[PDB]
Amino acid sequence: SMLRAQATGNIGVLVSRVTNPFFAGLFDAIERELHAHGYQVMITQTYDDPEAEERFLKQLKSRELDGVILASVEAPDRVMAVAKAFPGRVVVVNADVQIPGATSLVLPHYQATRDALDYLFNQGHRRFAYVSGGTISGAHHGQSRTQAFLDFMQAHQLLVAQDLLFGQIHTAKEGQAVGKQLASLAPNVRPDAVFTNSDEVAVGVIDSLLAADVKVPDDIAVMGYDDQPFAPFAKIPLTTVHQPVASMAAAATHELLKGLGRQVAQTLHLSLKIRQSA
């Protein structure tokens, strides 16, 4: 009797944080398409637990999932080893890293960050605050936007102000703290523009600036990132970089379903959405 491996009908999707509306939207878009194809979905989050990635991968290795889509990566080499044992079954999307053995979709965030910063320079801005959810320094993956910022400053012969760099800032509440610090500065030490890397962060930064009677954008311009659902509804509607959630979700899910043998074989752009905040 020849016994062939039987599909579980379960797929894992990993995000950093589901209370980040960008990740919620990306998750929804992927999960609904998987669901429509008859799959159930395991979700995990890594924002407060790097170990969550290994636990997630163990579910694939132990044959409880048919495949996984990762929208964030902790340890590329660990994901790689799993991908090589599970060809066609590991897909990485929008994680600012390419994983050998896994179909990896990398979006042009270096380019988008350069373009957004050039937009700000062209509006007359010269002193820049830069906020990131990652660290300011490091040789690890996930640094494309920070390198774009540094390269931008070099190209326009602008000196980086180390006091205007804010690392490990992810949420609106953390943004409020950044904004309060910026509003505290003497007009001549204050940044002209803030690159927030997050619409959640931007909403918080703006709230604190306005609370201190600092005008946005007239005194300080604030650039968001993602074009999240609340962005057009913000107190100062957000100028922001638009992530193509629906298109990247469709691409990632297609790559996985092709790998699982369910679909037959058949460019993702970041753009700048201009509103009021910058």
Instruction: Using CB under 5 A, list all residues that contact Cl ion.
Output: 17, 20, 94, 96, 106-107, 170
How far, in Å, CA of 70 to CA of 43, rounded? 10
Check residue 115 for interaction with Mg ion (CB under 5 A). Answer: no
| Contact call for residues 62 and 109 (beta carbons, < 8 A) | no
Give the residue with the Cβ less far from Mg ion, 89 or 190. Answer: 190
**With CB cut-offs between 5 and 8 Å by kind, which of Cl ion, Mg ion, none does residue 239 bind?**
none
Check residue 54 for interaction with Mg ion (CB under 5 A). Answer: no
From the CB of 112, what's the least distance to Cl ion, in Å?
10
Q: Which helix (H) or strand (E) holds 173?
A: helix 172-183
Q: Which residue has the tokens 């703290």?
A: 177
Give the residue with the Cβ less far from Cl ion, 17 or 190. Answer: 17
**With CB cut-offs between 5 and 8 Å by kind, which of Cl ion, Mg ion, none does residue 170 bind?**
Cl ion
Which residues lie closer than 8 Å to 84 by C-beta, 6 or more apart? 100, 101
**With CB cut-offs between 5 and 8 Å by kind, which of Mg ion, Cl ion, none does residue 192 bind?**
Mg ion
Nearest-CB residue for Mg ion: 192
Interface pattern 173-192 for Mg ion (x via CB under 5 A): -------------------x
Give the residue with the Cβ less far from Cl ion, 98 or 276. Answer: 98
Give the residue with the Cβ less far from Mg ion, 110 or 128. Answer: 128
- Reduced to 3 states (helix: H, G, I; strand: E, B; else coil), residue 93 is strand
Whole-Å CA distances, 271 to 48, 111, 122: 30, 10, 17
Give the residue with the Cβ less far from Cl ion, 96 or 192. Answer: 96
CA atoms within 13 A on the CB side of 108: 12
- Reduced to 3 states (helix: H, G, I; strand: E, B; else coil), residue 245 is helix
Give the residue with the Cβ less far from Mg ion, 110 or 119. Answer: 119
Scan residues 198-227 and list those touching Mg ion (CB under 5 A).
none
**With CB cut-offs between 5 and 8 Å by kind, which of Mg ion, Cl ion, none does residue 118 bind?**
none
SS3 content of the chain, % helix, strand, coil (to 5): 40, 15, 45
From the CB of 93, what's the least distance to Cl ion, in Å?
8
| Contact call for residues 239 and 277 (beta carbons, < 8 A) | yes
Summarize as ranges the residues that interact with Mg ion (CB under 5 A): 192
